[PDB]
């Protein structure tokens, strides 16, 4: 595979690792989610353009649409946590155990 594919896959891996490794804020986790979505968009777009899969050129746009839908979901959950706790700190999500 070309090195650009390697770089994009590595970017997706880094974003996934970042999302899996929270520090304090829930906003940064949503940032890592959006980064993974962007990396997947770039990967799919390069694949479709390279193979001239004309009818599949609409796939990245749909991916982007559902990506920002998930982003809006995350933002709404973020505001509710902040309203219920004052901060978006991931440590406040502690009532539910095990």
């Amino acid at each position: 595979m070309p090195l650009v594919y390697m770089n994009i896959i590595m970017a997706f891996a880094i974003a996934l690792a970042g999302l899996l490794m929270y520090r304090s804020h829930l906003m940064s986790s949503l940032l890592c989610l959006e980064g993974m979505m962007l990396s997947l968009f770039i990967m799919s777009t390069l694949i479709i353009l390279n193979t001239h899969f004309t009818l599949a050129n609409m796939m990245p746009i749909i991916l982007l649409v559902f990506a920002a839908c998930e982003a809006a979901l995350g933002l709404s959950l973020l505001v509710m946590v902040s309203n219920t706790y004052g901060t978006d700190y991931v440590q406040n999500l502690n009532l539910l155990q095990c």
């Binding site: 979505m37 799919s44 998930e70 995350g74 539910l96």
Partner: protein, 347 residues
Amino acid sequence: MNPIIYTTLIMTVMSGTMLVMISSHWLLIWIGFEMNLLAMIPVLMKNFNPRATEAATKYFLTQATASMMLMMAIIINLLYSGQWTITKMFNPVAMTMMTMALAMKLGLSPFHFWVPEVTQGISLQAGLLLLTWQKLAPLSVLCQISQSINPNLMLTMAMLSILIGGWGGLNQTQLRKIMAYSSIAHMGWMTAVLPYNTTMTILNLLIYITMTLAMFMLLIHSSATTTLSLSHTWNKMPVITSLMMVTLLSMGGLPPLSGFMPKWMIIQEMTKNESIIMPTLMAMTALLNLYFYMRLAYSSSLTMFPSTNNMKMKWQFEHTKQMKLLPTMIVLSTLVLPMTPALSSLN
């Protein structure tokens, strides 16, 4: 929440699952998963509590990670094959990533951690949907790609799921957490036979769905979320706790109850493929699930606990809400063992 809006959200969850189970394109399967998550989050948060918000956030995070991994696997499979159809995946790395994503969606251990928390956070009405309907789409996807599934990874996940579900269920006094760990164990049981025979997975899924529907509807009919609160139900309504004891015995996998059907057929299929250690270990580990079910049966019906004085007023009133499917779900989950040769209809 407006009832019209709630019905639209429930229909959107169902339409997402039907899109997953109906499409032939990977992009549409991922779209159905996304719609399921989008319409499931507010359904999780129908009753606004901090615990409900926490459950919704955790579920959203887990399902988002799983969907990202699934889409990455789809993209890699397209890259190495130029194909979008749901068929024999042509890349081992993509297959592994997709398996991890689908196990995370199902809650197979070690991706089990969110299930006890999200189940406890949400109400019984939402917990029933989460533990029954939300298992259809990932199981269907796994059944469509069972040929390309690496048997070692799926079997390890299934065995770990059974072990962890049993162990977690023993230390739980909250009914919802017990149900979540039992669901984890039963999901492990279902995914054990995926590489061998998918019709047995479908049979186990149907039996588990009936049993969990019966249990959750009995809990709703008793309005009980803890062992102590459920214990009082013997005084107001002994029929409900007796039926709950019967359903718990069925869930334990004790013959002649219906819960013996899936384990029996799974052991049969796994022994047909010369696997004798794994089914034996699974059967032995089911005893932990049987243990906590029996403990609940003691606290609920087999033994009577102290009630409170105020139950005298509750004795006068009769339940208004009527779940029409509860008797049928109880019967199908307890007395269907004489009907196993009906397995062929699932083929």
